[PDB]
Amino acid sequence: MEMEKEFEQIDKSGSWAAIYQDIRHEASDFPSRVAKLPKNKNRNRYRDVSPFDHSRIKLHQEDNDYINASLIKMEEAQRSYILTQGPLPNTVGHFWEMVWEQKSRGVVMLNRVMEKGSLKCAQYWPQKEEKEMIFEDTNLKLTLISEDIKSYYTVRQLELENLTTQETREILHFHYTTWPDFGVPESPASFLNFLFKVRESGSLSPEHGPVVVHCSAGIGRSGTFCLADTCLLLMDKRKDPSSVDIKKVLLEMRKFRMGLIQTADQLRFSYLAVIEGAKFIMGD
Numbered sequence: 001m002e003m004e005k006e007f008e009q010i011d012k013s014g015s016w017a018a019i020y021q022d023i024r025h026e027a028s029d030f031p032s033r034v035a036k037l038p039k040n041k042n043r044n045r046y047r048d049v050s051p052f053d054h055s056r057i058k059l060h061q062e063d064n065d066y067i068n069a070s071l072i073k074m075e076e077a078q079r080s081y082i083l084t085q086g087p088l089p090n091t092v093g094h095f096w097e098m099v100w101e102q103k104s105r106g107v108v109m110l111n112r113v114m115e116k117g118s119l120k121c122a123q124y125w126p127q128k129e130e131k132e133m134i135f136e137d138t139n140l141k142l143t144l145i146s147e148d149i150k151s152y153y154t155v156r157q158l159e160l161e162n163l164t165t166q167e168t169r170e171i172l173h174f175h176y177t178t179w180p181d182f183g184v185p186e187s188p189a190s191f192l193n194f195l196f197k198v199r200e201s202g203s204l205s206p207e208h209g210p211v212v213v214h215c216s217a218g219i220g221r222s223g224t225f226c227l228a229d230t231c232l233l234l235m236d237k238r239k240d241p242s243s244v245d246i247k248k249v250l251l252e253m254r255k256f257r258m259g260l261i262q263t264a265d266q267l268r269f270s271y272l273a274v275i276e277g278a279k280f281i282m283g284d
């Protein structure tokens with residue numbers, strides 16, 4: 001079926017939970033043996049969210065190459081994304097090592113450091129220009145260059161230096177700051193505006209390594225971001241945009257990381273975002 005009318009048909013019939021459970025039943029199951037090794041317990045935020053072995057990002061290190069991060073490679077859309085958990089106190093150096101080694105231009109953050117009164121990820125970037133951060137375990141230096149605070153999101157320019165080689169690179173930090181502590185946003189308008197700002201920066205384009213996207217577990221909000229982006233790109237590429245099947249795209253992405261889209265409300269919000277986004281692209 002088309003999307004917008006499949007949408008109204010699920011709303012009127014109140015069957016979002018049944019649709020979402022079908023997705024959960026059909027999703028791929030692949031091994032994640034490296035994630036479950038005892039030496040990696042303090043590298044995982046949640047025991048039930050792990051990268052598959054076949055798609056995990058490897059650190060360029062011979063001691064321990066493990067990080068909780070996955071490469072999502074979308075062949076028809078010609079887009080790739082790295083989806084990862086919010087960094088932990090003992091993985092902030094690994095996180096920036098990955099950004100460096102994978103040649104990423106942008107980092108997309110969809111959570112606040114504290115939500116619901118608890119810590120959802122480490123404070124992994126510097127908050128003042130004159131107070132830089134040094135990660136001694138991976139030999140990197142990170143400096144805040146500029147910060148632009150808007151009503152729904154903040155964009156930061158960061159300098160990452162590889163202290164071994166003295167090479168430097170500019171990294172863009174895109175921080176969506178207004179996702180509610182409970183539920184999903186009422187309108188997708190600010191989320192779509194944010195997606196378009198990431199696109200306009202070049203961070204999603206083939207001349208760079210894959211964008212790094214995270215929330216707390218790296219599967220819920222993070223899944224919504226890449227699902228919406230890929231669906232809108234396919235609607236632009238194909239002769240028949242009504243052929244794009246958001247459930248099929250989501251199942252393809254779940255071949256590369258488990259659990260993408262965590263609730264039926266996140267599934268409905270993804271439909272809403274793609275539907276509204278397709279009107280703004282055109283031609284409008």
Ligand SMILES: CC(=O)NCC1(c2ccccc2)CCOCC1
Binds near residue numbers: 159171
């Ligand atoms: C190489 C280059 O063009 N550097 C430009 C600046 C920069 C530095 C590092 C990260 C991002 C931006 C831009 C504004 O700050 C001053 C330097």
